[PDB]
C-alpha cells in the first residue's frame, strides 16, 4: 500500500570472536575432581568446539539465530558442570573484539563468552529485521518480531549480565539498543496498521508511541560517553532518529486530523493538519543528506498532508467557520505500546537440544 513509508532501519553489527580454549581446562577438572580419564569426554568437547565455530561464523539467516541460541544454552550446561566463571578453578581466557574501538578484550570467565553470544543474537535479529524491504504485511510482521527478539536479547543481557564486560555492552548502551529496537518494531507495526486501514485514532496512537521510543533513543544518543564511543555511528543514528521523531509525529497528527474529520470537528481538523504539516516540514529539513528511500517517503507524505491541510483550511474558512483550537488546548496523543522485548530462556531444551555434557557428572 502506498501509505506505508518504508523508511530504512538501523541494525547492529555482530562482534568478532577470539579464542576460548576450554578443552584443556575441562580435561584437567575431570581428572582432578571427577577422578576420571581426562580423555573420556573428547567427543563432547569436539561437539562444543564445532558448535562454537558455527556460532562465531554464523549464517545471516533465521537458522543462524537458532545456532546462537543453541550454543548459548550449551555454555550454560557446561558452566553448571565445570566451574569456568570468574575466579573459579577451570576458568580460561575468553577474548572478543569490542566492536566500536576494534580492540581485543579478554576475561577469564565463561559468562563473558555467554554475554557476547547473546549480544550477537540481538545483533543478528536486528540485521534480519532491517534486511526486509517491508512490501508485504508478512514482511512487516516478521520484521516487527525480529526487532522485538533483538530487544529481548539486549534486555536479557542487560538484566542478567549487569556488570559490563566491555563498553559496547554497558547498561546505557544496551538501553539505547532496546529502545531503538522497540521503536523499530513499533514502526513496523505502524506500517501494518496503515496497510490494514485500521481506525485513524489507533494509527495515531501507534505512531505517537514510535515517537516516544525514538525520543528515548535520542536522549541516550546525546549522552557524551555514548557519543564518544559510537563516534560517527552516533552522528548517523541521531540524524535518522531525529528525522523520524518529527516524521512520525506528523503521521500521528495527520491521523488525529482524520479522526476530527470523521467526527465533523472541522476546526480541529485544520489545527491537526497544520501541526502535521509543520512537523513534516521539520522532518524534511532534518532529512538533508538522507538516502532517496527517506526522501521518497517524505515526498509522498507531503502530497497527502499538504493537500489535506489546504483543503481543510479552505473548507473551514468558507463553509464551516469553526474555531481553530490552539495546539496546547487539545489533549496530547498518548502512545499505544504494542511491542515488547520478547522473553529469552537460554536453557529451554527446545532451543538447546540435548545437553552435550550429560555424561559429565
Amino acid at each position: 500500500m502506498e501509505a506505508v513509508p518504508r523508511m530504512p532501519m538501523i541494525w547492529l553489527d555482530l562482534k568478532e570472536a577470539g579464542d576460548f580454549h576450554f578443552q584443556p581446562a575441562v580435561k584437567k577438572f575431570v581428572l582432578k575432581n571427577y577422578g576420571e580419564n581426562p580423555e573420556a569426554y573428547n567427543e563432547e568437547l569436539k561437539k562444543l568446539e564445532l558448535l562454537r565455530q558455527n556460532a562465531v561464523r554464523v549464517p545471516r539467516d533465521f537458522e543462524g539465530c537458532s545456532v546462537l541460541r543453541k550454543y548459548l544454552g550449551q555454555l550454560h550446561y557446561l558452566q553448571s558442570r565445570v566451574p569456568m566463571g570468574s575466579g573459579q578453578e577451570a576458568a580460561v581466557p575468553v577474548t572478543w573484539t569490542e566492536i566500536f574501538s576494534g580492540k581485543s578484550v579478554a576475561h577469564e570467565d565463561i559468562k563473558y563468552e555467554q554475554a557476547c553470544i547473546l549480544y550477537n543474537l540481538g545483533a543478528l535479529h536486528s540485521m534480519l529485521g532491517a534486511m526486509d524491504k517491508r512490501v508485504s504485511e508478512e514482511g512487516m510482521k516478521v520484521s516487527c518480531t525480529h526487532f522485538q527478539c533483538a530487544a529481548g536479547a539486549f534486555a536479557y543481557l542487560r538484566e542478567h549480565f549487569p556488570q559490563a564486560y566491555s563498553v559496547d555492552m554497558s547498561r546505557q548502551i544496551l538501553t539505547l539498543n532496546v529502545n531503538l529496537m522497540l521503536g523499530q518494531a513499533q514502526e513496523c507495526l505502524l506500517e501494518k496498521s496503515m496497510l490494514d486501514n485500521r481506525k485513524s485514532f489507533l494509527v495515531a496512537r501507534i505512531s505517537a508511541q514510535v515517537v516516544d521510543y525514538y525520543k528515548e533513543a535520542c536522549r541516550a544518543l546525546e549522552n557524551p560517553d555514548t557519543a564518544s564511543l559510537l563516534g560517527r555511528i552516533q552522528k548517523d543514528w541521531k540524524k535518522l532518529v531525529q528525522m523520524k521523531i518529527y516524521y512520525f509525529a506528523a503521521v500521528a497528527h495527520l491521523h488525529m486530523g482524520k479522526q476530527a474529520e470523521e467526527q465533523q470537528k472541522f476546526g480541529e481538523r485544520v489545527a491537526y493538519f497544520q501541526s502535521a504539516l509543520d512537523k513534516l516540514n521539520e522532518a524534511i529539513k532534518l532529512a538533508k543528506g538522507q538516502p532517496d528511500t527517506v526522501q521518497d517517503a517524505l515526498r509522498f507524505t507531503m502530497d497527502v498532508i499538504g493537500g489535506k491541510y489546504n483543503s481543510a483550511k479552505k473548507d473551514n474558512d468558507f463553509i464551516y467557520h469553526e474555531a481553530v483550537p490552539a495546539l496546547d488546548t487539545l489533549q496530547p496523543v498518548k502512545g499505544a505500546p504494542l511491542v515488547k522485548p520478547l522473553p529469552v530462556n537460554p536453557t529451554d531444551p527446545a532451543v538447546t537440544g540435548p545437553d552435550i555434557f550429560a555424561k559429565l557428572v
Partner: peptide, 20 residues
C-alpha cells in the same frame, strides 16, 4: 522458530482487540 511464529500471529490479535 515455533515461538517466533506465535509472536508474529499475536500481532493480528493485538490490533483487533485494540481497535475494538
Amino acid at each position: 522458530d515455533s515461538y517466533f511464529k506465535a509472536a508474529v500471529s499475536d500481532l493480528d490479535k493485538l490490533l483487533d482487540d485494540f481497535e475494538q
